[PDB]
Design a binder for these strands. Structure first.
Lengths: 246, 1089, 218
RNA sequence: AUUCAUAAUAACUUUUCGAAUCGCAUGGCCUUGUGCUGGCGAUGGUUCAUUCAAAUUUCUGCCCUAUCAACUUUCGAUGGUAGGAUAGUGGCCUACCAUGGUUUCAACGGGUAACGGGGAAUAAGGGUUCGAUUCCGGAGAGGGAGCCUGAGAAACGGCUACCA
RNA sequence: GAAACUGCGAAUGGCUCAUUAAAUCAGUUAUCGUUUAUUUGAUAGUCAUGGUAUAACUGUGGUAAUUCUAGA
């Protein structure tokens, strides 16, 4: 191609999206936004294929013009808005909230969420830097750019952010024996507490994690996402608690 | 304009106010398969299960949890009535819109189920409901407005009978929201209580309406409540689609009687009148006729009381409302007019008479007009002239087919002495409108005419009040129909003797006397005194009336040959801004040339045609073609001095005429016959240059103050009736203040001759197009240069362009003073002025400037600036300026560098430009750099202090002088920093303005209060920078030159503000004054301080 | 050939067919921008002065200035030139075009009237057409009527009286570049918003400085 | 891991930006000026980050051919220094320098009705043979040569020349 | 709301595998050697508001002809 493409095949979609082969040749190519391409979800696939409330693009389009849903308080009117993991979805006329969070089945997962939990949101600080005029700041995993954070925080760090001000509620460091979500990889969604971290200078650092059934596995730090302390999640968790069984 | 033509898309933006304007209430004008109206278990339960299906809001779900635990049947309603209602109002004041729609719906059906016993709840329900409406006003939901007022109409339909028994209390519960200052809130509450009004029975109607009348007089201040009751009764009669009904005419009966009560407010009478107007506008006459019958009935009932004014008011509205298209019988109305007139046995009488003369049918007017005019002649005698004026502006042709002039003559015969100032006020006004030839034909009372003539006989004139009375009796004395010429004569020469310098009033009044002439020696005397009485249109009109009355005989030819200067004085009259007076001068001069001889030319006739052309964009090309045609004819044809002066002053009138295609035409025309006559036009253009900055006072005679004005009619709300009463009241105000209105309308008929400010710029464009004659004299424009105007910058620029376009530029009148001002404006900051100054300076031909022409040109240019600086301002390089050429062109370089330093450093670009200026400064030479410093000190001054010792001559602490000061001390700091060790100081060019500036900073600190925050801030900055450059120059030069002369003065400016508290002020960080003191205490020669 | 003669002052224009060759020999060897004597053309244009404005050849190929050759030529035309309207952005196609030097091959020579001589021309000098559009900008209409700076223009708005059957009506353009109190409110919000942001940034900076100072004191 | 982030200095610029925009409504003031303040959203805008990208770049892997053993280096083949060019690294190119580099572990060049892969067939396995062909990657749009616009084209339902 | 100016797209889609044998492709890199229109998130105190135009349109034309145009 002599540039980017506007087109997305049916089979070209990520497998976790659970979209059939037969009701289309095309998947809706998601627009650019916070998250990256394969670990997102368009809102129309969210609504029609999970919430089932609309069945057509004209329907969901009319809804977006009806200005209902606010993602983190902000409405989008984009159909293919790239909604990713750990997201707050606010439903006014139905009076609900939804945390978008990975499935034990490796898929995504809606979560029925109250207003107090929707008031804030979580974020993996991925890069702390020093900006122009010597201003210190961070960029999270969801692309939130926050000036002037607490100096004790470093990269990859879990931060509770109030959405209502878009401000740093509090933070959680990266220690062993912290409750961690795994975002990507084969074992994603399997919530566990970190055993430790095999570190490599310049290399992909591996992480050993043990979960409640005393089961240990190893993923990469990119998949690693700390939630909270032991028995202390800052969020409400869905059924199964991220536990793989037979 | 609203959206009338619907576009094709399914989704309009539909703003909130538009939603409000489209919203209505009544569900009976709506309908549907209502679920509560559809299933009949219980209405409240049906609505509750329906909204339990529909709504998903947390407020309503908690509510529904509680209530679906509480009530499941109508006995459960009747048992737990209070608790469910308290939970209802709890969530109602919990204020959730998503729950507010269904909760309002359950409120409505809860009342529908609980009817007769609900009222105890219903009252504080009204309270909380109107609180919720105010909450929606804080919010912005047309949906919430619709839901609330729909619920309101629901409760009204459910609980009608108890509320129509207790109606006036329900009005009181909503009055603060009816009188609430929101038109649409008032409108919606008016629709709901209007439904209730159309429901209510007659006894409660009369009671409630009378109490509304008293409530109106209580809140006489409020108009929103007034209009609310307007639209209330309006909708109560309007309710259907096009036809008011029998309940509407019953309401009309009730309101009509209750307002025809003598104690009823006349404000409520106007309210009724506007209600009637709106109903008449809405409904059709087939629906309207029984209401007309009930109206005539109640008129014949209550026709005899003290409220004849009130019935006259409502009848005036009835006659005016639309037309005979809703009026059944002008004959019935005529009968009621006879009844009201017999019962009366003023202002509103005049208005009703005029509206009947307009609005009625001619088949009724052919019989009632005699009775109408006898009624008017008898009753409204002084108001007859006001009425006749309003009727002539309303429908003149009606009375002209009828006998307006006859009854006018009868009125004049019956009375002419009482309101003779109003008589002229009528007869002055009729002159302008040319549809009044019958009026300018009509006759006058003979006693009145002879009394005016005898007052003219016995007239003393030596007062401007006497001028007022004589001019008044003249403007009555127009239609004298007698030989009045020899009676005009002695008063005319009396004025011409007694007044050498006439007032504009004097000219106008004697010109009215020239108009009074109908059918020799008067022409002789006006040819004597026209030189005084030239410029006034009323004079010119009466004079042309004389001349057109006259016939060209040979004795008059002899006298006109004896009188020489008439046509040149008329050319001077052609030089005037007013096209009307210039065309009047035109036709006068034509007729005079016919009387004199037969030399009447095509130029005069054509330019008459040109003044006769109106001004449109469609006639613009035509007019410019015409101007080019007449200019070509004037240039081709041979010219007398008379006709040349004519053509020139006429073209300059067309310069004044204020039209761009005409300006193009005259700019095409004039550069070919300025050769024909370049002498007179030199005075014409120069007069325009001196035009407006000289005063233009048009001081007229002012009469004494008379306070005649009345609210002669009620205040309306329908805007057409508002316009009519405004017109009638304006004419009444004039007729009451007849004195000054005669004065003002005379000025309104006098005409303007004040020149535009742009005429100076037009003369500047003429001076651009014609440089040689400006290059010829130059003696009168030299004062403008040497006074420096304040003119506009574009004026100065086009003048500088004329200066560049000058050819013999060195042999102008004061060449060196021109060069001085040229150098000043070259040093000026405005780069366009610098360009034009260099253009005039290069018009000044000297071989060194011809050498470095393009050099200083690219120096003036911006994007080659620093490169040119590094190129040929660099010492010991290519294109470096030679010795004697440098000596002779040096001041120009310092002027352009003064400007390029005078640019403000708004950005890094301008900052770097100024930096490069000051950084290439160190290389030139000592006296040249000192001359740049001399110019920098020359933009300032020190001779105040140094003609004194240290005393201020005038306390000028002004922003302009201190901004020049701070620019000076800033370039002083910069020059210090870039020439620390090498620069020459001069006590006259460097030292004295600096101590002048620090002392000025101290004086603007001390002498004024601390309220001038910007002046005191700039004072602090000036002291800062002045002491900064003080210590800078002290460390920079040390002992390189002497210090003993200015020693005591700089020590004085040290010891005045600082040494008292220098220890208290300078302790945080070492001040520049501290560094100065330490350089003093270190350098041994500076130990004297 | 056909001399399309145009008087721009009247905005008038006509054509004049020419059969003889002697005025054409007067015309020969010239090009666009150059001037000519109407008397040297003929009798009726006595004293008249024109200037070459254009032409089209006997195949229709127009003359174009810049090229000094009395023939046609294939020039790689670009956007901002005459004789060319690109249907796409940046479109540059090569086209054949008659040149600027006057040849006999012109079906049409088009001349503008520079200076009038003595005799009135029927189609051009006798009558005119007034302009189609008055200006739309507020300062434009100010310059046009000589409107003062204190003077408003909405009273001076040029209105066309149109008529549709019996409903006579008028037309008036939107006054572009017009200062409004709404513009003042817009400017006011701009200033207030900038100042508000400055205060908020300063406050957040001061608070974060307080925070880090306390943390360092720990 | 860094001459990094970031901060300071001294200048520089055919000197960039720091809203002359727009729609809905219209409030609060008060010196009663048609003076002052005020909402909603719409566009644009500097820098950074994101996202979508693209461009380079490493390891490992190709069918046959020795009756194919030497090969590349004027004309860049191998390496160096400097410049240019680029969006950048880089012989990519230019200069001035050194003589390199690969190969029987098959270099090179030749054949390939050779688009690569996931996949398809077959046997019990080992294997064998296909795969233009629903996805991905790259290439092209009669073929040589070249270009404009645009963030993105050497575009071809764009443009210039050749040949047909 | 025609037209026209302005904005953006028109560098994807669809068709074919001519060519191409470490070339692509695949896996595995990495760009601390690159730019990024767009999304998103942050991000700027340092005249009651100039001018030039030109389309569209009016009007005169060319030719055998084109989604050709010229003059005004």
């Amino acid at each position: 191609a002599r540039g980017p493409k506007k087109h997305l095949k049916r089979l070209a979609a990520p497998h976790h999206w659970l979209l059939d082969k037969l009701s289309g040749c095309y998947a809706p190519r998601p627009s650019a936004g916070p998250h990256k391409l394969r670990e997102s979800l368009p809102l129309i696939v969210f609504l029609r294929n999970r919430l089932k409330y609309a069945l057509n693009g004209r329907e969901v389009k009319a809804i977006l013009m009806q200005r209902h849903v606010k993602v983190d308080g902000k409405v989008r009117t984009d159909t293919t808005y790239p909604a990713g993991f750990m997201d707050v979805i606010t439903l006014d006329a139905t009076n609900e909230n939804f945390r978008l969070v990975y499935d034990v089945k490796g898929r995504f997962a809606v979560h029925r969420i109250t207003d107090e939990e929707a008031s804030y949101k979580l974020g993996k600080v991925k890069k702390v830097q020093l900006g122009k005029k010597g201003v210190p700041y961070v960029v999270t995993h969801d692309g939130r750019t926050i000036r002037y954070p607490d100096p004790n925080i470093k990269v990859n760090d879990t931060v509770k952010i109030d959405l209502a001000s878009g401000k740093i509620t509090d933070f959680i460091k990266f220690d062993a024996g912290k409750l961690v979500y795994v975002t990507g990889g084969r074992n994603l969604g399997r919530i566990g507490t970190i055993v430790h971290k095999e570190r490599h200078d310049g290399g992909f650092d591996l992480v050993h994690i043990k979960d409640s059934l005393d089961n240990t596995f190893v993923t990469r730090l990119n998949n690693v996402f700390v939630i909270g302390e032991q028995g202390k999640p800052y969020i409400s968790l869905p059924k199964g608690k991220g536990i793989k069984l037979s | 304009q609203r959206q009338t033509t619907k576009s094709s898309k399914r989704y309009r933006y539909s703003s909130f106010k538009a939603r409000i304007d489209d919203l209505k209430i009544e569900p009976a004008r709506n309908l549907e398969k209502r679920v509560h109206d559809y299933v009949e278990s219980s209405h409240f339960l049906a609505s509750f299960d329906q909204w339990k299906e529909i709504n998903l809001s947390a407020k309503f779900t908690e509510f529904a949890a509680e209530i679906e635990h509480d009530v499941q049947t109508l006995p459960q309603i009747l048992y737990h009535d209070k608790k469910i209602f308290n939970s209802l109002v709890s969530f109602i004041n919990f204020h959730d819109e998503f729950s507010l729609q269904p909760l309002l719906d359950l409120l409505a059906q809860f009342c529908h189920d609980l009817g007769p016993d609900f009222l105890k709840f219903y009252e504080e329900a009204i309270k909380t409901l109107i609180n919720l409406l105010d909450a929606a006003i804080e919010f912005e939901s047309s949906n919430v407005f619709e839901w609330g007022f729909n619920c309101l109409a629901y409760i009204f339909k459910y609980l009608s009978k108890f509320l129509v028994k207790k109606l006036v209390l329900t009005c009181d519960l909503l009055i603060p929201l009816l009188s609430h200052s929101k038109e649409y809130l008032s409108r919606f509450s008016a629709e709901a209580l209007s439904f209730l009004v159309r429901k209510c029975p007659v006894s409660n109607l009369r009671e409630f309406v009378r109490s509304v009348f008293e409530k109106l007089e209580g809140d006489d201040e409020q108009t929103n409540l007034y209009e609310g009751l307007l639209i209330l009764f309006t909708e109560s009669m309007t309710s259907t689609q096009e036809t008011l009904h029998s309940k509407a005419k019953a309401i009309m009966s009730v309101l009509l009687h209750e307002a025809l009560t003598k104690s009823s407010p006349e404000r409520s009478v106007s309210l009724l009148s506007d209600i009637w107007m709106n109903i008449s506008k809405y409904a059709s006459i087939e629906s309207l006729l029984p209401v007309y019958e009930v109206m005539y009935q109640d008129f014949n009932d209550s026709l005899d009381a003290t409220n004849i004014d009130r019935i006259l008011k409502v009848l005036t509205t009835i006659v005016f409302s639309e037309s005979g298209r809703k009026i059944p019988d002008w004959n019935k109305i005529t009968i009621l007019i006879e009844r009201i007139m017999s019962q009366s046995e003023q202002d509103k009488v005049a208005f009703l008479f005029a509206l009947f003369i307009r609005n009625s049918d001619v088949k009724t007017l052919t019989l009632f007009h005699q009775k109408l005019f006898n009624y008017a002649l008898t009753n409204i005698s002084d108001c007859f002239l006001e009425f006749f004026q309003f009727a002539l502006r309303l429908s003149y042709e009606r009375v002209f087919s009828f006998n307006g002039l006859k009854f006018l003559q009868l009125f004049l015969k019956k009375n002419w002495q009482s309101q003779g100032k109003k008589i002229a006020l009528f007869f002055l006004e009729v002159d302008d409108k040319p549809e009044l030839q019958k009026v300018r034909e009509v006759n006058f009372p003979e006693e009145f005419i002879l009394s005016i003539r005898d007052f003219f006989v016995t007239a003393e004139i030596n007062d401007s009040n006497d001028l007022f009375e004589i001019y008044w009796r003249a403007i009555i004395f127009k239609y004298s129909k007698l030989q009045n010429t020899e009676i005009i004569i002695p008063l005319l020469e009396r004025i011409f003797s007694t007044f050498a310098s006439p007032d504009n009033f004097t000219k106008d009044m004697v010109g009215t006397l020239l108009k009074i002439y109908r059918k020799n020696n008067l022409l002789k005397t006006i040819l004597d005194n026209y030189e005084n009485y030239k410029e006034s249109l009323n004079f010119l009109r009466g004079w042309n009336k004389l001349v057109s009355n006259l016939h060209p005989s040979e004795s008059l030819k002899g006298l006109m040959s004896h009188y020489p200067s008439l046509l040149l004085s008329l050319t001077d009259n052609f030089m005037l801004p007013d096209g009307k007076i210039r065309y009047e001068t035109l036709e006068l001069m034509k007729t005079l040339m016919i009387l004199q001889g037969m030399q009447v030319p095509d130029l005069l006739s054509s330019c008459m045609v040109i003044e006769e052309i109106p001004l449109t964009l469609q006639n613009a090309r035509d007019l410019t073609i015409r101007i080019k045609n007449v200019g070509a004819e004037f240039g081709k044809t041979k010219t007398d001095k008379l006709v040349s002066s004519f053509f020139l002053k006429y073209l300059f009138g067309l310069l004044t005429v204020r039209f761009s295609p005409v300006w193009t035409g005259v700019f095409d025309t004039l550069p070919n016959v300025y050769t024909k006559d370049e002498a007179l036009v030199w005075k014409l253009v120069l007069s325009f240059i001196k035009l407006p900055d000289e005063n233009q006072n048009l001081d007229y005679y002012q009469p004494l103050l008379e306070d005649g004005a009345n609210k002669v009619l009620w205040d309306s709300s329908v805007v057409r009736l508002r316009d009519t009463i405004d017109t009638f009241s304006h004419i009444w105000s004039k007729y009451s203040t007849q004195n000054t209105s005669i004065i003002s309308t005379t000025i309104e008929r006098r005409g303007n001759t004040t020149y535009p400010i742009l005429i100076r710029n037009q003369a500047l464009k003429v001076m651009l197009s014609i440089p040689q004659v400006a290059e010829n004299h130059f003696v009168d424009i030299a004062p403008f240069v040497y006074n420096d105007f304040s003119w506009t910058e574009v004026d100065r620029n086009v003048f500088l362009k004329t200066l560049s376009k000058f050819k013999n530029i060195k042999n102008v009148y004061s060449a060196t003073e021109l060069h001085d001002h040229l150098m000043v404006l070259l040093g000026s900051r405005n780069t366009d002025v610098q360009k034009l100054a260099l253009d005039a300076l290069l018009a000044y031909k000297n071989p060194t400037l011809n050498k470095y022409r393009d050099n200083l040109k690219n120096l003036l240019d911006d994007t080659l600036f620093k490169d040119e600086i590094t190129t040929f301002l660099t010492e010991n390089g290519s294109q470096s300026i030679k010795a004697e050429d440098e000596k002779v062109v040096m001041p120009y370089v310092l002027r352009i560098f003064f400007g390029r330093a005078q640019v403000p450093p708004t950005s890094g670009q301008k900052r770097s430009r100024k930096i490069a200026v000051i950084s290439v400064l160190p290389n030139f030479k000592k006296p040249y750099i000192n001359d740049f410093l001399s110019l920098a000190s020359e933009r300032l001054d020190y001779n105040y202090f140094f003609g004194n010792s240290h005393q201020i001559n005038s306390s000028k602490a002004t922003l302009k002088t201190i901004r020049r000061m701070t620019g000076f001390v800033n370039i002083v700091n910069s020059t210090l920093s870039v020439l620390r060790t090498n620069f020459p100081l001069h006590t006259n060019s460097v030292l004295q303005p600096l101590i002048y500036s620090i002392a000025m900073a101290y004086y603007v600190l001390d002498t004024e209060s601390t309220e001038e925050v910007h002046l005191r801030k700039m004072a602090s900055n000036l002291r800062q920078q002045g002491l900064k450059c003080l210590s800078s120059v002290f460390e920079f030069v040390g002992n390189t030159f002497d210090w003993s002369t200015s020693m005591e003065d700089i020590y004085a400016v040290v010891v005045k503000p600082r040494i008292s508290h220098f220890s208290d002020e300078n302790l945080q960080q070492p001040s520049s004054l501290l560094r100065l003191f330490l350089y003093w205490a270190h350098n041994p020669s500076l130990y004297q301080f | 050939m056909k001399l399309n003669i145009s008087y721009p002052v009247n905005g008038s224009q006509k054509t004049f067919e020419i059969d003889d060759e002697h005025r054409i020999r007067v015309f020969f060897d010239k090009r666009i921008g150059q001037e000519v004597d109407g008397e040297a053309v003929g009798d009726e244009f006595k004293g008249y002065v024109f200037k070459i404005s254009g032409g089209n050849d006997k195949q229709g190929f127009p003359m174009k200035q810049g090229v000094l050759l009395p023939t046609r030529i294939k020039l790689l035309l670009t956007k901002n030139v005459s004789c060319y309207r690109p249907r796409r952005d940046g479109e540059r196609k090569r086209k054949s075009v008659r040149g600027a030097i006057v040849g006999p091959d012109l079906a049409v020579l088009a001349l503008v009237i520079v200076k009038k001589g003595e005799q009135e021309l029927e189609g051009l000098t006798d009558t005119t057409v007034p302009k189609r559009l008055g200006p739309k900008r507020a300062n434009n209409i100010r310059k046009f009527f000589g409107l003062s700076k204190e003077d408003d223009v909405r009273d001076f708005v040029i209105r066309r009286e149109v008529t549709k059957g019996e409903k006579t009506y008028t037309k008036a353009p939107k006054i572009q570049r017009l200062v409004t109190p709404q513009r003042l409110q817009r400017k006011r919000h701009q200033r207030a918003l900038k100042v508000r942001n400055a205060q908020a940034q300063r406050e957040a900076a001061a608070e974060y400085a307080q925070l880090l100072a306390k943390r360092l004191s720990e």
